[PDB]
Design a protein around this ligand. Structure first.
Ligand SMILES: [Cl-]
Ligand SMILES: [Cl-]
Ligand SMILES: [Cl-]
Ligand SMILES: [Cl-]
Ligand SMILES: [Cl-]
Ligand SMILES: [Cl-]
Ligand SMILES: [Cl-]
Ligand SMILES: [Cl-]
Ligand SMILES: [Cl-]
Ligand SMILES: [Cl-]
Ligand SMILES: [Cl-]
Ligand SMILES: [Cl-]
Ligand SMILES: [Cl-]
Ligand SMILES: [Cl-]
Ligand SMILES: [Cl-]
Ligand SMILES: [Cl-]
Ligand code: NA
Ligand code: NA
Ligand code: NA
Ligand code: NA
Lengths: 170, 170, 170, 170
């Protein structure tokens, strides 16, 4: 999957974050071996040597840890709708629908503007190396039997998700 | 997957909500045929006749639409940590770790209480029939070329996600 | 302020939570004396002896700590809009607008249903005694110079905010 | 109030957003005249001619509407805690506490790094002119009796809140 500007989004890292959350829950659910399985899957997804992780980096964003980078894991849309008289807006939305049919992203944004609709793209990002470290260290803590401490690191990984919301400039 | 009280959670409906969000994004991304594919997958997941949807219902919660029910699609944990002197807390967390190792959910909650830690379970829920209607109607709108209107219904489905946060009573 | 069912909402406790968040920020901002001022204000708001805290309790919700209760601190609305043909919906929204003008909450919900609109009320709640303890203990830690530990307790108080989203039954 | 980098944050615009949310709720609560009062207060706060709105602008962020700018309305902190042996971390947190006592923001971030703690600052932003337009147009709709349409614009204003989460570079 790609952003509106055609930058690649990591589905593997998205699934890894899903696995991290499920792993943390299973620690409290009395299923620590399931938690290890889920964290192990997240580790494999984030460290896949056949994946070119450069493809997912958001270059213009400084990560908290030196030498790390944020990668894109999801994109969503926020619309903001101005008030328009019902007739004028129905007409402009019809033109927006044509541009979406045609695959014309720029034309869609422009037609939506005529409909009183602004578009914001919300890019969900994680720091790649910091998240990798959380997962591998959490598994090590699970190996040692320090399950609560592992859960803290899995929560830390989730709390490292940020959302860059940016106006659409195509 | 199951809640702390061993009530079943619908992984199919969780994936359907993920598909609904991706479908909405692809409308704005100029990929309406991909959006239809994703919404069609969500429709199949939510309407699987081999699934016993009764297994996922949260009975004690009134859905907005008459005759509908909320179903569980995810569970997560929130902890609240009281301040304790470092030594006393390390000791109580060690006992909590033993109870998690043993699969003893009740014992884990009790040991965590001694560590100054309260546990809340956050159950993510959707209204099943209302969400089904949003998806099927969105696909129909996509068939008609009314892509923006379809996106509104997909957003409505996402906005119907609620989170029941409850103290753990095992 | 009151909920749709006319149950009282604590504006003092809402402001206390706002103060708790600002206090935590000021610890990291190198303004620990400002952080203490803000936490002291939150403590005074949550422990106001002239306030009848019973008025804000949500009775049907078990708090994590024995003998505690959740209180209401905010209410908001989520709407879910079904697809309707433009003309039929404009007509039903006009009737909904009349019922809101008249102060007729039940009539508003019913007219909105005819417009394809379901209404959910989101009640923001905090555990009163647990939050009080977090604030007073955080101030004590600030007095001792243990600012990071105080920040952890202020964050814990914020993480204790839950949102009960319920269908409107007037 | 100021960010970690000493950029000013608009408390007036924060209160305006709070008023916008309360105004929307009161429309559904059958208190449209209270909703107008709250929206009128938000309008006065956002359009205060004695306020130098330049002080709050985040210059490096393109707003969706041409000629508009994002302004800062809140700052919060996210910490990410690496696993450290209890003794080593207690010692590093003690040094972090000293730097916060001294008002040394840079020193606090550095000491926290030694404790395994990274710091992210979350800046809540709104587009100033777009939000002003939502409020003034919502009041006009309320004057006309179009309360549901006003509520849509108030929700749009709230949905325009974005959170810029950035690594701390002092
Ligand atoms: Cl297991
Ligand atoms: Cl570093
Ligand atoms: Cl989206
Ligand atoms: Cl949206
Ligand atoms: Cl496509
Ligand atoms: Cl109904
Ligand atoms: Cl969890
Ligand atoms: Cl938590
Ligand atoms: Cl100060
Ligand atoms: Cl207790
Ligand atoms: Cl609201
Ligand atoms: Cl809404
Ligand atoms: Cl009123
Ligand atoms: Cl524009
Ligand atoms: Cl904060
Ligand atoms: Cl945090
Ligand atoms: Na794509
Ligand atoms: Na399970
Ligand atoms: Na009220
Ligand atoms: Na300040």
């Amino acid at each position: 999957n790609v952003t509106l500007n055609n930058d690649k989004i990591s589905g593997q890292a998205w699934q890894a974050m899903r696995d991290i959350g499920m792993s943390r829950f299973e620690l409290f659910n009395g299923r620590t071996q399931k938690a290890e399985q889920l964290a192990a899957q997240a580790e494999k997804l984030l460290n896949d040597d056949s994946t070119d992780w450069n493809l997912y980096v958001k270059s213009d964003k400084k990560a908290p840890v030196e030498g790390d980078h944020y990668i894109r894991i999801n994109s969503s849309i926020t619309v903001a709708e101005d008030y328009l008289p019902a007739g004028q807006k129905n007409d402009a939305i019809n033109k927006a629908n044509q541009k979406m049919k045609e695959g014309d992203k720029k034309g869609t944004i422009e037609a939506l503007k005529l409909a009183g609709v602004s578009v914001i793209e919300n890019q969900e990002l994680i720091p790649l190396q910091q998240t990798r470290k959380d997962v591998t260290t959490a598994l090590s803590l699970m190996n040692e039997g320090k399950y609560y401490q592992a859960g803290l690191l899995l929560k830390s990984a989730q709390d490292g998700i940020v959302v860059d919301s940016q106006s659409v400039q195509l």
